């Protein structure tokens, strides 16, 4: 996975991943998608279509105005859709799971899927379920979607306090200062604009952030276009750093968020344990529980489990880039899997996969990546209570 791929952050595409378990517990962000709003593509368009009128585009400028006009037609009626690469990212995840754990899904295995009400959550579910059903049509499948799992998969919109922190919160003054410190527009304008001076300093940054925006998502759409040549590997690096810091402060352990963005996910960590505990006892015959949602679900959820490095509390804004990497945690199609195993002697082992790679918890095990479930369920129970007590503050 290349540096420029990584600098896409949460817009990065899901990377390459070319005994038996008895239960699998899963949460997945939808795969590669289209841009969700024409906001960025329009700021770019109206600036460039201004300069052209005034006869003030560079040659590369008309180049960019071309593509942009193209991408406008290629994005028509597609806003928010999951992309063909998303369909593929999900079929691969599920395909791999089925090759890895065939016994788990053989015969009349019962599985269960939930998704938010959001069309591309549901298109993910369907992508996932199709592969499984075509590999084994004798699966038993419960499929469901809707506002009802909002408290589980969109808790980040139900918490009045978080909502307020996120809109007019304290991380904002730190993010704006960081953007001005890390991103100089004036070297990027004159690439496309004759006389970039008469553009306001504020509008220049509005334009250059929209431009990074348009470029960064472009690889997730499966369109042959590609605008990474727009920027030097260092512009992409500085830009990534302002967004890695935005994801981190609005959405994870940034000490400015006082743990509030992480705590709001305990309803989901709890359904995760419920789901499992029900299978380990017998109030559920489910081989699997799949859940499809969003980056805003995954990020706080991953931090609340305390998967190593994701819970890090870092006080210097420029250090965060070193210890917290959002393309590590929440690429496109980012997924958490718990795989439960019952060994000879009847003891339970859980293995946690972040994006199909073994995760570490700050609890012991003489059998890594396999942790004792007793230990784990207790550890997570510590985290949940420790989140309810931060939310009590609010």
Ligand X SMILES: O=P(O)(O)O[C@@H]1[C@@H](OP(=O)(O)O)[C@H](OP(=O)(O)O)[C@@H](O)[C@@H](OP(=O)(O)O)[C@H]1OP(=O)(O)O
* Binding-site annotation, residues: 6, 10, 29-30, 33, 36, 120, 154, 247, 294-295, 309, 327
- Does 295 participate in binding ligand X (rule CB under 6 A)? yes
Which span (5-13, 58-66, 172-180, 345-353) binds ligand X, by CB under 6 A?
5-13
- Does 159 participate in binding ligand X (rule CB under 6 A)? no
Cβ(146)–Cβ(117) below 8 Å: yes
Q: How far is the CB of 366 from its own copies (least distance, A)?
A: 5
Q: What angle do CA 137, 143, 145 make, to 5 degrees?
A: 155
Cβ(9)–Cβ(239) below 8 Å: no
- Does 296 participate in binding ligand X (rule CB under 6 A)? yes
Strands (E) across 168-306 are located at 286-293
Nearer to ligand X, 43 or 294 (CB): 294
Buried b (16+ CB within 10 A) or exposed e, 331-348: bbbbbbbbbbbbeeeeeb
Q: Please identify which residue in the block is written with the tokens 């299978």.
A: 279
Nearer to ligand X, 36 or 144 (CB): 36
- CA distance linking residue 363 with residue 12, whole number of Å: 30
Q: How far is the CB of 267 from its own copies (least distance, A)?
A: 22
Nearer to ligand X, 26 or 33 (CB): 33
Q: Which residues ranging from 8 to 37 are in contact with ligand X (CB under 6 A)?
A: 10-11, 29, 33, 36-37
List C-alpha distances in Å: 252 to 172, 268, 384: 14, 15, 15
- Does 204 participate in binding ligand X (rule CB under 6 A)? no
Q: How far is the CB of 75 from ligand X (least distance, A)?
A: 13
Cβ(362)–Cβ(237) below 8 Å: no
Could you count the other beta carbons within 10 Å of the beta carbon of residue 299?
27
Q: How far is the CB of 38 from ligand X (least distance, A)?
A: 10
Cβ(336)–Cβ(354) below 8 Å: yes
Q: Which residues ranging from 310 to 329 are in contact with ligand X (CB under 6 A)?
A: 325, 328
Q: Which residues ranging from 106 to 125 are in contact with ligand X (CB under 6 A)?
A: 118
- CA distance linking residue 302 with residue 291, whole number of Å: 14
Binding-site residues from annotation for 1D-myo-inositol hexakisphosphate: 6, 10, 29-30, 33, 36, 120, 154, 247, 294-295, 309, 327
- CA distance linking residue 328 with residue 44, whole number of Å: 29
User: Which partner, its own copies, ligand X, none, binds residue 246 by CB below 5 to 8 Å per kind?
Assistant: none
Nearer to its own copies, 2 or 53 (CB): 2
- CA distance linking residue 332 with residue 33, whole number of Å: 8
Nearer to its own copies, 292 or 324 (CB): 324
User: Which partner, ligand X, its own copies, none, binds residue 26 by CB below 5 to 8 Å per kind?
Assistant: none
User: Which partner, its own copies, ligand X, none, binds residue 315 by CB below 5 to 8 Å per kind?
Assistant: its own copies
Q: How far is the CB of 19 from ligand X (least distance, A)?
A: 27
What is the three-class DSSP state of 146?
A: coil
HSE value, Cβ hemisphere, 13 Å, CA-based, for 162: 23
- CA distance linking residue 239 with residue 176, whole number of Å: 12
Q: How far is the CB of 116 from ligand X (least distance, A)?
A: 8
Nearer to its own copies, 144 or 382 (CB): 382
Write phi, then psi, for 140 (nearest 5 degrees).
-105, 125
Sign of CA dihedral 304, 305, 306, 312: negative
Cβ(261)–Cβ(310) below 8 Å: no
Q: How far is the CB of 309 from its own copies (least distance, A)?
A: 6
Q: How far is the CB of 252 from its own copies (least distance, A)?
A: 13
What is the three-class DSSP state of 392?
A: helix
Cβ(349)–Cβ(359) below 8 Å: no
Q: Which residues ranging from 160 to 189 are in contact with ligand X (CB under 6 A)?
A: none
User: Which partner, its own copies, ligand X, none, binds residue 314 by CB below 5 to 8 Å per kind?
Assistant: its own copies
User: Which partner, ligand X, its own copies, none, binds residue 312 by CB below 5 to 8 Å per kind?
Assistant: its own copies
Which span (204-212, 218-226, 234-242, 289-297) binds ligand X, by CB under 6 A?
289-297
User: Rule CB under 6 A: which residues touch ligand X?
Assistant: 6, 10-11, 29, 33, 36-37, 118, 294-296, 325, 328
């Amino acid at each position: 996975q290349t540096k420029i791929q990584k600098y896409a952050g949460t817009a990065m595409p899901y990377p390459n991943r070319t005994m038996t378990p008895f239960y699998i517990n899963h949460l997945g962000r939808h795969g590669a998608r289209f841009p969700t709003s024409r906001k960025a593509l329009d700021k770019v368009e109206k600036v460039l279509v201004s300069a052209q009128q005034e006869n003030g585009l560079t040659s590369e400028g008309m180049a960019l105005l071309s593509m942009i006009r193209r991408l406008s037609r290629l994005f028509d009626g597609q806003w928010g859709k999951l992309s063909k690469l998303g369909e593929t990212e999900q079929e691969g995840i599920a395909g791999r799971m089925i090759r890895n754990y065939p016994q788990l899904f053989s015969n009349s295995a019962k599985i269960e899927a939930i998704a938010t009400y959001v069309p591309r959550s549901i298109n993910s579910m369907d992508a996932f379920l199709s592969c499984m059903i075509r590999h084994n049509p004798a699966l038993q499948v419960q499929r469901s979607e809707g506002k009802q799992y909002n408290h589980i998969l969109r808790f980040f919109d139900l918490n009045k306090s978080y909502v307020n922190y996120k809109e007019k919160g304290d991380w904002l003054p730190i993010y704006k200062a960081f953007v001005h410190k890390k991103i100089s527009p004036v070297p990027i304008m004159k690439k496309f604009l004759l006389n970039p001076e008469q553009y306001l300093d504020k509008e220049a940054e509005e334009f250059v952030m929209a431009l990074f925006s348009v470029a960064a998502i472009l690889p997730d759409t499966s369109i042959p276009l590609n605008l990474e040549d727009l920027f030097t590997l260092d512009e992409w690096h500085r830009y990534w750093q302002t967004q890695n810091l935005r994801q981190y402060m609005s959405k994870s352990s940034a000490p400015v968020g006082k743990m509030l963005p992480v705590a709001i996910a305990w309803p989901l960590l709890s359904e995760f344990i419920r789901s499992a505990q029900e299978v380990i006892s017998g109030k559920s015959d489910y081989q699997a529980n799949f859940r499809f949602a969003h980056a805003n679900t995954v990020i706080p959820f991953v931090s609340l489990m305390g998967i190593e490095k994701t819970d890090v509390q870092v006080c210097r804004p420029d250090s965060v880039s070193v210890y917290w990497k959002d393309y590590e945690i929440s690429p496109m199609a980012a997924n958490v899997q718990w795989l439960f195993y019952r060994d000879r002697d009847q003891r339970i082992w859980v293995k946690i996969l972040l994006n199909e790679e073994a995760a570490a918890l700050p609890i012991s095990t003489a059998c890594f990546p396999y942790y004792s479930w007793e230990k784990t369920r207790i550890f997570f129970n510590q985290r949940i209570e420790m989140a309810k007590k931060t939310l009590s503050v609010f």
